[PDB]
Design a protein around this ligand. Structure first.
Ligand SMILES: Nc1nc2c(ncn2[C@@H]2O[C@H](COP(=O)(O)OP(=O)(O)OP(=O)(O)O)[C@@H](O)[C@H]2O)c(=O)[nH]1
Ligand SMILES: Nc1nc2c(ncn2[C@@H]2O[C@H](COP(=O)(O)OP(=O)(O)OP(=O)(O)O)[C@@H](O)[C@H]2O)c(=O)[nH]1
Ligand SMILES: CCc1cc(/N=N\c2ccc(C)c(O)c2)cc(CC)c1OC
Ligand SMILES: [Ca+2]
Ligand SMILES: [Mg+2]
Ligand SMILES: [Mg+2]
Lengths: 155, 426, 436
């Protein structure tokens, strides 16, 4: 079953092996036990070329794992700016909500990825989106005294 | 209470550790070769606290230098006082920890820890009355964090009746945007709560904000940050190194600063804040308590002071000091827990640091430090909830439950701070 | 003659002891090397000052004194100072590690390492005595050594010298000069454990001495040296009866007889007058009536409290200098016609009077003007309970939250000893309220 192999190749950044497996019919939208797809794993580990190739061959840019995490959630969490932009250009839901009530903006804010915060805002990120405890991205900035982030969020 | 054995682990620990030795050497008249070259006998009365006196009237730091990465070595020796260190006290591995706490604590670090303790034994046996240990390290990396806390554990086991003191540098996205640092820091704080008596929280978030916003340095370097760290380190050790009205030592500081064993994380401050190349007693006093002057990114006015120690350096009216310190306590009496009477102590040293004629150093046990642990906990939780990069740790033998225990212990620490923030005498 | 041994414990005890023995030597005509010309009996004797000084055969007069500290810095200055040749070298005893402001370290762990050496050195002095009367113990309340090691020492002295009297000079803490936040703990801990073993304890409130130095001596920021020289003048006035001839408080037992009606309430209040700045050497010389009246002004008290809110159970007036007895009696008659002076209904309402006709001595380098007549009043008043109450309250604030208690539990002490000591203080305060 080439699904597991494509999931591992995407996580490991083996570009050439990703192309081969999709030539032999590998499921581009295969899921691991937790519901993560090749695109999830490539976006987590910063493999831009694999992100782009997957999106050009039928990957669901807005696929969700069992916790509601989309590839954009993870790229915004880990801080892969170009992957964030590629995912958005291919139709990523900028305001996707996971089981914790978090949007990509929440995660980039928590992790201090300020450039990604700006990109998400330019693409319509909801500054009023609340997590399960009622906090918006701005509340997180105010609560942790991140003046740089709070300035960006008030643009 | 005389000798302090200094340990510096990892890149950050050895970096700020080297600047520490450069600063106190200058303050004490020790030149890069180990010879004394000063003009005051006060520089020498308590020199034995940090220096071993060798044959030739040469003073040698009681300093042990540790890193799993050889690269940091050549950097220290090529430094100004790099040759002052005992060559035998360099204990350096071949493969770094790769910013992996697990490699530092369990695999790479465990292989080298025995070699490090061999050197700690030697130094310790050469002491008349060992006070304890002082470790410099970061919590966001793998060596200073993982192996540093491993070393603390082993040393507490061999020297259980000695004070363990740390200068722990907390990570911040503003300086190193590596997302596993909250993992490494939470796993370490878990270790520091149990195995250290006193920890100075040096927050890279605060250091960046000071340089960027206050000193207007558009792109702070590690040198800029470390300029503030070396100043803080010199201030908080002033009374160990210079003889004053008080025979201050590490245990007397712990006994009077730590009312509850786990709440031993101090918020340091310093005034005036200056850049690497560039004031009245009341100004010194207000700036010392100012949140802008804190080396931890927390507002003291959002919590309550359990205990506070202040150190004034320079030629100045001791009575003016006494009257300013009393003033700051009565006007802002709500920020000092009423159930610890007379919880602010002041010391004045005549010798000021380099480049300044008057300075003040602040050491607070404030409940506001929970803002720092909350910031780390929130980043830890954001990463951990998505299980990002966990095989890097379990691939070295850790259990997933080791992460939940650390997070649970850190959140308990936060709750303990909040409990005493809201407590009343009534 | 009957010998008295002085014991100084911890920094405050040692430094005040230096000041006192400096004063003693001047008062008796003894040089820093022990030589005393006015002594015609060389090699020994039975003079009154032999209570405090042994005598070698080479003319050397040696204090019957022991200095003990758990760290050496302070005592090292005695060993290298003006009086490095005065004391028995073996009676300057130092450890290498102090008690870290922790009563439990001074008493249980650190203190146990040196207690037996201290006792063996004390027995050495006691063995040179023909009739030891007891001990004078100097120490702070707030220090870990002054509190914890003193309590351990007093416990061992009671067992090893059951028949001998023990007097205390204890330095009561003041936030102005305080060193540690846990000093209320240490103060209550040592008081509880020392109460049964001490016969009479003269507390010295550092705040009261601080205020006298500022107001009377015009010293802006008093140092320990300023405080200690003023304290030594008061100690000297209290111990003068033991070192000179006289009819009042001639031995340690009489201190209890005259000042301590019951064993537990043995904390007399000392008041001293006149305290005049040495920069005013041409002051009006105060009369007996004037200096006697000043002993009832709270400003001249050695412990901050209001004797007008209390009752007297004993009153002893100790005069020095040009003091004619009839003028004392007239001055006392006046006092007895003051309704702010209320005695308990079961004690002799009179006053006990001693006069040493030698004018008081002032130390070179001191801040006190020389005066022709001075007085120290020793009274046992229930108002001293106010000082215990201040300490009890600071103790209660911290102990309610168990703040700092782990430092004591970790050094060989049970948590229950806190509540046991506090309850003992509760009983002491009711003892005072019942007499009041
Ligand atoms: N203030 C300050 N922080 C530093 C310095 N060097 C590294 N850091 C911080 O330390 C953290 C990374 O830990 P390091 O000390 O570099 O890593 P290590 O302890 O050597 O262990 P390895 O990652 O395996 O090399 C990050 O938060 C950095 O921002 C420094 O010189 N000054
Ligand atoms: N009057 C007076 N008080 C002193 C002096 N030295 C210290 N004190 C007071 O004593 C208390 C501290 O106790 P210390 O005697 O210094 O401590 P210690 O007995 O040496 O015990 P350690 O904790 O081991 O240092 C504080 O209240 C000080 O203000 C002194 O020379 N004169
Ligand atoms: C070198 C370590 C050190 C030790 C001290 N010892 N005792 C202290 C401390 C705090 C307080 C609240 C107290 O009451 C006593 C005091 C200071 C400065 C006053 C000090 O310098 C940081
Ligand atoms: Ca004789
Ligand atoms: Mg490194
Ligand atoms: Mg001491």
């Amino acid at each position: 079953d080439l699904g597991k192999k494509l999931l591992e190749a995407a996580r490991a950044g083996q570009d050439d092996e990703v192309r081969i497996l999709m030539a032999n019919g590998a499921d581009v939208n295969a899921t691991d036990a937790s519901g993560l797809t090749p695109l999830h794993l490539a976006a987590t580990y910063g493999h831009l070329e694999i992100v782009e190739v997957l999106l050009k061959h039928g990957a669901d840019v807005n696929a969700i794992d069992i916790m509601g995490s989309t590839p954009l959630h993870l790229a915004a969490l880990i801080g892969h700016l170009e992957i964030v932009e590629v995912l958005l250009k291919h139709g990523a839901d900028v305001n996707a909500v996971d089981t914790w009530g978090d949007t990509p903006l929440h995660l980039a804010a928590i992790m201090g990825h300020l450039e990604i915060v700006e990109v998400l805002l330019k693409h319509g990120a909801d500054v009023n989106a609340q997590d399960k405890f009622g906090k918006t991205a701005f509340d997180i900035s105010i609560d942790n005294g991140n003046e740089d982030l709070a300035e960006i969020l008030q643009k | 209470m005389r000798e302090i054995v200094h340990i510096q682990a990892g890149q950050c620990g050895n970096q700020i550790g080297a600047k520490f030795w450069e600063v106190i050497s200058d303050e004490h008249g020790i030149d890069p070769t180990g010879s004394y070259h000063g003009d005051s006998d006060l520089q020498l009365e308590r020199i034995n606290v940090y220096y071993n006196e060798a044959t030739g009237n040469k003073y040698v730091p009681r300093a042990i230098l540790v890193d799993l990465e050889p690269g940091t070595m050549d950097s220290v020796r090529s430094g100004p006082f790099g040759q002052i260190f005992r060559p035998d006290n360099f204990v350096f591995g071949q493969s770094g920890a790769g910013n992996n706490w697990a490699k530092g604590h369990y695999t790479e670090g465990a292989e080298l820890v025995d070699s490090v303790l061999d050197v700690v034994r030697k130094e310790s046996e050469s002491c008349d009355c060992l006070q304890g240990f002082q470790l410099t390290h970061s919590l966001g990396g793998g060596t200073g964090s993982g192996m540093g806390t491993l070393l603390i554990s082993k040393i507490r086991e061999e020297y259980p009746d000695r004070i363990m003191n740390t200068f722990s540098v907390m990570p911040s996205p503003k300086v190193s945007d590596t997302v596993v640092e909250p993992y490494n820091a939470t796993l370490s704080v878990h270790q520091l709560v149990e195995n250290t008596d006193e920890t100075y929280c040096i927050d890279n978030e605060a250091l960046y904000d000071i340089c960027f916003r206050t000193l207007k340095l558009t792109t702070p370097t590690y040198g800029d940050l470390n300029h503030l760290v070396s100043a803080t380190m010199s201030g908080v050790t002033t009374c160990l190194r210079f003889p004053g009205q008080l025979n201050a030592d590490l245990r007397k500081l712990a006994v009077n600063m730590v009312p509850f064993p786990r709440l031993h994380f101090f918020m340091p401050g310093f005034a005036p804040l200056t850049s690497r190349g560039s004031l009245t007693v009341p100004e010194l006093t207000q700036q010392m308590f100012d949140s802008k002057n804190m080396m931890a990114a927390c507002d003291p006015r959002h919590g309550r002071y359990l205990t506070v120690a202040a150190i004034f350096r320079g030629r100045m009216s001791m009575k003016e000091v006494d009257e300013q310190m009393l003033n700051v306590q009565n006007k802002n009496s709500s920020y000092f827990v009423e159930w610890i009477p007379n919880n602010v102590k002041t010391a004045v040293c005549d010798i000021p640091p380099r480049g300044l004629k008057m300075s003040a150093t602040f050491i607070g046990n404030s409940t506001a430090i929970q803002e720092l642990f909350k910031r780390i906990s929130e980043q830890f939780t954001a990463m951990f909830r998505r299980k990002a990069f966990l095989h890097w740790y379990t691939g070295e033998g850790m259990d997933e439950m080791e992460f939940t225990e650390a997070e649970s212990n850190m959140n308990d620490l936060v709750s303990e701070y909040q409990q005493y923030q809201d407590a009343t005498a009534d | 003659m009957r010998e008295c041994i002085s014991i100084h414990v911890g920094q405050a005890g040692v430094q005040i002891g230096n000041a006192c023995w400096e004063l003693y030597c001047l008062e008796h005509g003894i040089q820093p090397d022990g030589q005393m010309p006015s002594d015609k009996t060389i090699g020994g004797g039975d003079d009154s000052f032999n209570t405090f000084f042994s005598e070698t055969g080479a003319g050397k007069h040696v204090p019957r004194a022991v200095f003990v500290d758990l760290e050496p810095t302070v005592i090292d200055e005695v060993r290298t100072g003006t009086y490095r040749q005065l004391f028995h070298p073996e009676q300057l005893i130092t450890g290498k590690e102090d008690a870290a402001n922790n009563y439990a370290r001074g008493h249980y762990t650190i203190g146990k390492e040196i207690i037996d050496l201290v006792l063996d050195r004390i027995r050495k002095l006691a063995d040179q005595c023909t009739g030891l009367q007891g001990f004078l113990v100097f120490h702070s309340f707030g220090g870990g050594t002054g509190s914890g090691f003193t309590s351990l020492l007093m416990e061992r002295l009671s067992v090893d010298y059951g028949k001998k009297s023990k007097l205390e000079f204890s330095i009561y803490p003041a936030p102005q000069v305080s060193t540690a936040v846990v000093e209320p703990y240490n103060s209550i801990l040592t008081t509880h454990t020392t109460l049964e073993h001490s016969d009479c304890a003269f507390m010295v409130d550092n705040e009261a001495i601080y205020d006298i130095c500022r107001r009377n001596l015009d010293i802006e920021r008093p140092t320990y040296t300023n405080l200690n020289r003023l304290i030594s003048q008061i100690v000297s006035s209290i111990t003068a009866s033991l070192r000179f001839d006289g009819a009042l408080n001639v031995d340690l037992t009489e201190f209890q007889t005259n000042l301590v009606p019951y064993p537990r309430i043995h904390f007399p209040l000392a008041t001293y007058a006149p305290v005049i700045s040495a920069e005013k050497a041409y002051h009006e010389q105060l009369s007996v009536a004037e200096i006697t009246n000043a002993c009832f002004e709270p400003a001249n008290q050695m412990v901050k409290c209001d004797p007008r809110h209390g009752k007297y159970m004993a009153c002893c007036l100790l005069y020095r200098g040009d003091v004619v007895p009839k003028d004392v009696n007239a001055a006392i008659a006046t006092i007895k016609t003051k309704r702010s002076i209320q005695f308990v209904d079961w004690c002799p309402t009179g006053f006990k009077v001693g006069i040493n006709y030698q004018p008081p001595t002032v130390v070179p380098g001191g801040d006190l003007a020389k005066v022709q007549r001075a007085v120290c009043m020793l009274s046992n008043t229930t108002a001293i309970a106010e000082a215990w109450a201040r300490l009890d309250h600071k103790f209660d604030l911290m102990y309610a939250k168990r703040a700092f208690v782990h430092w004591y539990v970790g050094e060989g002490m049970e948590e229950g000893e806190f509540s046991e000591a506090r309850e003992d203080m509760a009983a002491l305060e009711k003892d005072y309220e019942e007499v009041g």
